[PDB]
Ligand binder design. Structure first.
Ligand code: 1IS
Ligand code: 1IS
Ligand code: 1IS
Ligand code: ZN
Ligand code: ZN
Ligand code: ZN
Ligand code: ZN
Ligand code: ZN
Ligand code: ZN
Lengths: 307, 307, 307
């Protein structure tokens, strides 16, 4: 258990995990215990696993340890408000997947790695960083005393690793557009069926996108401050693009700061609002994420106007 | 001994310890040896103690290792210019107290810890961080080979730990206002008596405030640059307050930068000038701190005007 | 071998080593193998040496590990395009010298160390930091399993250490002006002779300056961004000068930012263009460095105008 205020507010979708890093591991363990149960993991193994995962996130402005636990919390909130839908293994796997989904991130996009000709791009032609995140996850699990899935049968172990793999790959935003489009069609026609594994994998994929982007679903003061972190990374990549003799897209171009308000508008309209609209259609109890997304859209519109 | 320039200028109240971190331990050892004597501490134990204290200060903009040694230097200057007043134990304890007085500081105020519902606030209802600083000090002393007070009698050990405890607690600025007010009254009436232990504890408390705030007693270029560090911390806390859904006070509000000159004025008038005025009354050789404080007040007045 | 793009573009003088730190060691090993040969160093010893050198560079804005490898690359490009001129030992020694030439740099100039009265200034009256860089190099070589020159004869070992010493000392820009002037005279009169050791030492000295300053020979986007790093250091030193009660020169004065374009002009005209002009005269295949320097001069002239 946690302090009184945290216990209460952790159940809210728009919860912020706070600036005290050494409380984040305990926040995660709390979430796991309420989501899966106190006997889902051996506590000693789990804590060892969490600290090794922490050590393999880098000190970058956005794709860091705080992001990992923040993404995990959003998944916790989704799971707790749709608690009859998911199995034991899925709850286990998804929280872990979220915690590990950006492991060893450098603060650079897949396209930058390709243009730089980074060895990872030679190894992984598609979803380069995401395949690397999964590879890192697996490597940590293979460390002595780190296999938190020790007590599972081989059959169950293979299932949860596949849940984790698919989920981490789904955080490649390039795959989200096609996935969301398919889910929309299946929802409208009544074809969508959570008993169908391929349909289920898609819904989980959308859940992963929703959690990954959850910065846009916090209250305005948090959403606005987090934007500074995201652009710190993007502008750094844009600097590196210019060093390769390539003009970066405006989003990554430090010199085009004034276009931020309009750029944000475009993203909410093109990416965020559709993501949470579709997720809310499929899983109605995720409605608060959509409301908060809409509220942040209203705030960016006011910045553009000058209010 | 130190380089020629340092030897000379370390005796000045407005000395700056410089940007070379690995010289700060030697600066402290120099001060201890001149203040208490070369046989006050076993050198090997003292160096081990200093390095563990350094390791338990965090990389924050202001409440860091540099602040700790800077505070210790101000106490050194007070002690050397009032050298007949204090006992062996008090000189020992006060330098150590100053070095440890912000141990494990996160860069957040007591009020923020309370509002966040941080576990330390549940443990320590009053002077939350200061009670924690003392707890940290004690923990370091209990480490193998770290008890720098090994050679003291039990009686003396208990006295110096109490000197340290009271001194560290006195750095809670919330307790300064009441303390200064009492000292003022006792000074005016002739009641004040350094042979009275409770009166003595108050004077030491004021000395601790004076050392803690000594940023405002450096020369203008140092005082102005240090302000950047202090606001880096304050504005970060104000950001966190906004993330809890609480509007921070203007001092901690990044958006109210233009109010800095006037805010500083208010602090010098309400806090700093009274502190050093009262200290100078009680201990006349601390006069240079008051003069330099007044000079910085004049500089902030010129910023407001535009000069 | 390296990724395809790196293999190709590493041969260009204006190559940028990129933002992936863990590739820099492999970039260096690649350069050594192509420059000297695959049997010049025992690979295990070399990698151990490289990692210890990395550990002894500090996290400062400019005089860091990236600068060290960048300087080494420029020397690689000079060596590969003048491949018949230099001996086995010289190629070995110069790459190593470049990698170690700023070892343990604090981000402060020799003059600041003198004014602060830093112990290094008492030890080394001339070329203070450069003598320290060499001392650090030697200390690393003396570590167990770190003597990468193990297989050399004593005679050869002494020669390469002297090559390294002279080369590192030559990176003291204060010595460059006199050296360049002498080389100019010897070139014009036909006196200059690479078979004369003292003349040869001078030419190597100029090569070291050219590599050290090679920031001004990159493409404009790299050159412009690197300027931010250099001023971060300079302005920090200027801050420290003000803390000693000394007005810093405008270059190190944060308050005189607007003078950057004109200040840069002056440096290109007074230092950079003459350096690469003289180097190109002596070693014609280094011409691309001069062209790129001239192009950056044109860019700074356009900043001044407003284009
Ligand atoms: C893919 O872009 C983003 N991913 C995000 C994840 C969390 C929060 N925001 C995210 N964003 C973008 C950043 C903004 N989009 C743009 N900003 C600019 C700025 C300047 C010029 C063009 C653009 S597009 C939303
Ligand atoms: C408690 O405030 C401070 N503690 C200090 C310790 C050392 C040096 N300065 C200290 N200060 C304050 C910072 C300033 N006071 C204020 N600044 C502002 C800025 C904006 C709006 C209101 C205020 S009050 C003196
Ligand atoms: C010695 O100065 C420099 N060393 C450099 C090495 C690499 C790249 N640039 C270097 N520079 C200087 C920085 C600039 N010179 C000046 N800048 C200013 C700025 C303000 C006022 C005076 C000056 S001189 C070239
Ligand atoms: Zn990702
Ligand atoms: Zn992510
Ligand atoms: Zn404090
Ligand atoms: Zn303090
Ligand atoms: Zn140097
Ligand atoms: Zn250098």
């Amino acid at each position: 258990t946690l302090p009184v205020r945290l216990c209460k507010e952790i159940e809210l979708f728009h919860f912020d995990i706070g600036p005290f890093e050494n409380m984040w591991p305990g926040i995660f363990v709390y979430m796991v215990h309420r989501s899966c149960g106190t006997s889902c993991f051996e506590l000693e193994k789990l804590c060892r696993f969490i600290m090794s995962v922490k050590k393999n996130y880098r000190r970058v402005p956005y794709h860091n340890w705080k992001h990992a636990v923040t993404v995990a919390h959003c998944m916790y909130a989704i799971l707790q408000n749709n608690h009859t839908l998911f199995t034991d293994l899925e709850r286990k796997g998804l929280l872990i997947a979220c915690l590990c989904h950006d492991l060893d991130h450098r603060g650079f996009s897949n396209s930058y790695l390709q243009k730089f000709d980074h060895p990872l791009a030679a190894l992984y032609s598609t979803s380069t960083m995401e395949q690397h995140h999964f590879s890192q996850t697996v490597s940590i699990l293979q460390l002595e005393g780190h296999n938190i899935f020790s007590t599972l049968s081989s059959s169950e172990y293979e299932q949860v690793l596949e849940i984790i793999r698919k989920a981490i790959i789904a955080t490649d935003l390039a795959l989200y557009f096609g996935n969301r489009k398919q889910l929309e069609e299946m929802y409208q026609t009544g074809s969508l069926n959570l008993n169908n594994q391929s349909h289920r994998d898609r819904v989980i994929g959308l859940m992963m996108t929703a959690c990954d982007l959850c910065s846009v679903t916090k209250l305005w003061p948090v959403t606005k401050l987090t934007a500074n972190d995201i652009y710190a990374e993007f502008w750094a990549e844009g600097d590196e693009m210019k060093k390769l003799g390539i003009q970066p897209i405006p989003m990554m171009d430090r010199d085009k700061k004034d276009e931020v308000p309009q750029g944000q508008l475009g993203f909410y309209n093109a990416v965020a609002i559709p993501c949470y609209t579709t997720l809310t259609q499929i899983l109605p109890p995720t409605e608060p994420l959509l409301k908060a997304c809409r509220d942040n859209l209203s705030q960016w519109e006011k910045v553009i106007r000058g209010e």
